[model samples]
Target: GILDSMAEIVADKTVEVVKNAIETADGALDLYNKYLDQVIPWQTFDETIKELSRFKQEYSQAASVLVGDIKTLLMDSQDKYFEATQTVYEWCGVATQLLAAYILLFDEYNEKKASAQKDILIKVLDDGITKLNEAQKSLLVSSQSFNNASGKLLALDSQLTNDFSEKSSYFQSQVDKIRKEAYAGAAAGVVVGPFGLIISYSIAAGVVEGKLIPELKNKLKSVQNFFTTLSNTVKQANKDIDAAKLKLTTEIAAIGEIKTETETTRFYVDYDDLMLSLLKEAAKKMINTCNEYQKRHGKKTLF
Candidate 1:
C-alpha cells in the first residue's frame, strides 16, 4: 500500500514539478541573457533547477506517508497518544520535505560564496567524494526529490492557499494607501495653481501702481512748470505794455505847447513800433518753449 501510494504521488508530483521547473528554466534563461549584458555571471540557473527537482521527490514521499499510512494509522488507533503520534509523523514528513527545499536553496548560497576554496573544501569534500561541482549528479538527485515534494504540496494545497491569500490582502492594503497619497498630492496641486496666479497678479499690480505711476507723474512736472512760466510771462508783458502807454499819454499831456498833428503822428508811430517788436519776441519765445517741451515729454498721451 505504501509503495502504491508513493507511485501515485510520484506520478502526480513529477508532472507538476517538471512543469514548474521548465517555467523556472525559461525565466532563468531570460534573466541570464539580461544579466550577461550587465556582465554578471550565471550562477543560480542550474542550481535552482536541481533544487526544485529534489524538492519534488521529497514532497512526494511525504505525501505518500501522509495519505496512505497516516490516515489508516489514525483510524486504527483507539488511544489518543497513538493518534497524536501518527499525526506528528505525518506532519514531520511534510516538514522534512519543506526543510529539504530550504536547505537546497541554502546550498546554492553556499556555492555562490566569495571564495571557491572555502566552498570546495567544506561543501565538495566528503571523505574524498567531491559533490559540489557535480551538477549532473546533483540534478538527478534533486529531480527525484522534487517529484516526491510536488505530491506532498498538492495534498496540503488548501493550507498553502490560505497562507498566500492572507499575504495578498496585506499587500493590497499597502497599494490602497499609496493610491490615496497620490490622489491627495494631485488634488493639492490643482487647488494651489489658481491661487498662485492670483497672488502673482496682485503683487505685480501693487508695484506698478504704488511705485511706478508716481515716478512717471513726478517726471512730467517739468512740462507743467514750463507752461505755467510761459503763461505768467505773457500776462506780465501785456501789463507792462499797458503801463508804458499810460505813461506816454501822461507825458504828451504834460508837453501841452507842441503842435497837435505832430504829437499825434509821433505817438501813433512809436506805439505801433513798440507793439510789433513785443509781439515778434513773444512769438519766437513761445515757439522755442513748445519745441523744448515736446523734446522732453510729448510721446506719452493718456487721451
Candidate 2:
C-alpha cells in the first residue's frame, strides 16, 4: 500500500509535465519536408513493400541452406552462431510486419495524398523504396559473405580438430616421456615425504609450461582472426540496415497527415504506429543479439 501510494504521487507529478508536450508538430513536419529533393515524381509504395518481401524471402532461403551447411560450426559453439542466426531469422518477421503496417497506412495515405499532406510523401516513398532496394542487396551480400566466412571457419575448424588429434597424440607421448624421465630424475632422490611432493609438482610444472605444441599453435593460428572478421561483418551488416530502419519512424512521425486522419478521423494509423513501434523494438532486440554474438565470438578464445 505504501509503494502504491508513492507511485500514484509520482504519476501525478509526471503527468503534469507530460500534459504540456503538444503543439510542436509543424516544425517537425517542416524539417521533414526539407530533406526531399527539388523535383520529385510519383512512385508506388506497394512495389517497395513487395520487393522487400521478395529479397527477404531470398535471404531466408539462403539462410536455410546455410544453417544446414554450418550445422557443425553452429552446434559446436551454439552460443555464437545460433544466437546471431536465430536473431537474423526474427528480424525477417519484424520487417515483414513493419511493412505490413506501412501497407495499411496506404489506405489513409491515398485518401490524404489527394488532398493535404506534403508532396514529399511521393519523393520519400520512392526514396525509401530505392533505399530499401539497396538494403536488400546489401543484406544478400551479407548473407553470402556469412556463408563465405562460415565455410572458411568450418574448414579451419575441421583442420584444427584433425590436426589437434595428431598434435594431441604427439604431445601426450612427450608428456609420458617426461613422466618417465621425471620418475627417473626423482628416483635419484630415493623419494621421501615433502621432497617427493615437491619433485612431483616440479615435474607437473614442466608439463604445464609445455602448453599446446608449436604445430598446433600454427595450425589454429588464424582461427581467431577469421572469427573476428565474421564477427565484424555480421555487426556491420546489421548496423547498416539499422540505418535503413530510421526511415520509417522519422517519416511517420514527421507526417502531419497521419495525425489528422488517424487521430481526428477514424482510420487509426496511430494504432498502426504503436504496433510498428513495438515491432521496431522487436527488430532492435534481434539486431542487438546479432551484435551481441559478434562481440561474444570476437573475444572468445577457442581452447
Candidate 3:
C-alpha cells in the first residue's frame, strides 16, 4: 500500500506538471502568432516612399521637412517591431521554463518505470523540447538582427536628411543673394543703360535657370538615390524577418503535434488512466498537507 500510494502520488504530480507545460506552450504559440500579426509589410514601406515622392513633387522647397517625417515613420515602425520581438522572447522564456519543469517531473516518473513504452514517450518529449529550444534561439537572433538593421536604416535616413538640409540652405542663400543684387541694380537704373531693369531681370533669370535650379535638381537626385538604396535594404530586412516568423510558426506547429501525440497515443493510455483516479485523491491530500503545514507555521501554502 505504501508503494502504491507513492506511485500514485508521482503519477498525479507528473500529470499536473505536464498539463501546465502544455498550457504554457500553447500560450507561447498564441503570443508568437499575435506578434506575427504586427509584422510590417513590405507594402507599407513602398507606400510611404510613394508618399515621400508626392511630397517632393508638390513641395520641393519643403522636401527636406518630409525627410524628418519619414524618419519618424520609420522609427515608429521599428519600435513596434522591437516590441513585438521582445514579447515573443519573453513568452518563449516562460514557456521554456515550464517545459523544463515538465521534463523533470516526467523523468522522475519515467526513471522509476523500466518500460519500452515509457522510453518512447520520454524520447518524444525530449525531441519536442529540443526543437522548441532551437526555435527560441533562432527567434532571439533574428529579432536582434532586425533591430540592428532598423537602426542602420534610421541612421542613414538622418544622414541623408542632414545632407539635403545643408544643400538646400546653401541653394536658398545663393538665390537670395542673386535676387538682392538684381533688385539693387534695377533700382540704381543708370548702372546698365535705358534697359537696366530688363537687363538685371534677364540676368537673374539666367542665373536661376542655368545654375541654381540645376544644382538643386542634382541635390534632389542624390537624395533620391540614397532613399532608393535605403528602401531596398528595408525590403530585404523585412524578408528576413518574415522568414524567421515562418520558421517560428513551423516549430510551434511541430511542438503542438508532438503534444497531441503524447496525449493520444497508446503509450500514454495506461499512464493517463492511472492518473485519473490518483489525481483527485492526491489533490485532496495535497490541500490537507498544505493546511496542516500552514496551521503549524503561520504561513500560506507555497503552491
Candidate 4:
C-alpha cells in the first residue's frame, strides 16, 4: 500500500509540475507575442527547435512516469481502474504525437534555415545593395509593426504579445540601420571599407538573432507550454487552436467577431490552431482526472 500511496503522491506532484510548466510556457509565449520582432531571428529559430525538442523529451518522460505509476497501481485493480487506464492511454497517445511533432518541426526548421541562408546569401551577392536594403527596410517595418501591433494582438489575452513585440521592434531597428548605412556606402560602387563590413555583419547578425533564435525559442516554449498544459488537462482537451478560438469566440462572437474572408486571416487562424494544439491535451487530461476524483471522493478527501 505504501507503493500505491507513493504512486498517488507522484501523480499529484506530476500534475502540479505540469501546471507550473504550463504557466511558464504561457508566460514565455506572452513575451514572445508582444516582442515577435526580437523573437523571430533565424538563429533563435534553431535554438527554439532545440528547446522544443528538449520539452517534448521532458513531456514524454513525465507521461511515462505517470503511466508507469498507473500501471503499477493496476496490478490488483478491477473494473474501476479501467477508466484510469484509458486515461493513461490518452496521455501516452498525446505525448507520442507531441514528441513526433516537435522532432519533425525541429528537422524542418533546420532544413528551412539552411535553405533560407543559401537563398538569401545568393540573393545578396547577386542583387547586392538594392535587394539587401529592401530586406533591411522590410524587417524594419516589421519591427515597428510588431511593437505597435503586439498590445492590440495581446489585448486578446495572450500574454506573450508585449515581450515579442518589444524585442522584434528593437531588432528590426538595428537591422534596418545597419542595412541602410551599408547600402549607402555600397551604392555607386563606393568602397565600403570597415563600415560596409560592419553593415554586412550587422545584417548577418540580424538574420541570426532577429528571426532565428527567438523564433526557435518561441517554438520551443510553445511546445513546452502545450505539453505541460496538456499534462494538466488531457482528457477534455481539444486541439490547441480550436480551443483558443472557442475561448476567444466566446468573448468576441457577439461583437461582430467574425473574421473577414481574407487569406491572411486563414493563415493566422491556422497558426493559432497550431499553437493551441501544442497546449490542449495535457491540460485537459489533468483537469479531467481532477474533476473525476472530485466527483467521486469530494474535493476535501485526500484518500
The best candidate in terms of TM-score: 3
Model 1 lDDT tens row, 166-211: 2454323423443344344453432111101112222223334454
Candidate models: Cα lDDT each: 0.30, 0.35, 0.49, 0.33
Query: Which candidate wins on lDDT?
Result: 3
- Each prediction's total of clashing residue pairs, residues at least 3 apart in sequence or on different chains, is 21, 0, 0, 63
Residue 162, model 1: Cα distance from true site in angstroms: 89
Candidate 4 residues lying further than 4 Å off, grouped into runs, are 34-303
Count backbone overlaps in model 4.
63
The TM-scores, one per candidate, come to: 0.17, 0.27, 0.37, 0.17
| Rank ordering of all candidates by lDDT, starting from the highest | 3, 2, 4, 1
RMSD of each: 59.3, 20.2, 15.4, 30.4
Q: In terms of TM-score, how similar is model 1 to the real structure?
A: 0.17
* Residues 254-290 of candidate 2: C-alpha lDDT, one tens digit per residue: 4334333323322212223444345334334433433
Candidate achieving higher lDDT, 2 or 3: 3
Model 4: lowest-lDDT 10 consecutive positions:
260-269
Pitting candidate 3 against candidate 4, the one with the higher lDDT is 3
Error of 1 at 129 (Å): 99
Candidate 4 matches the true fold with a TM-score of 0.17
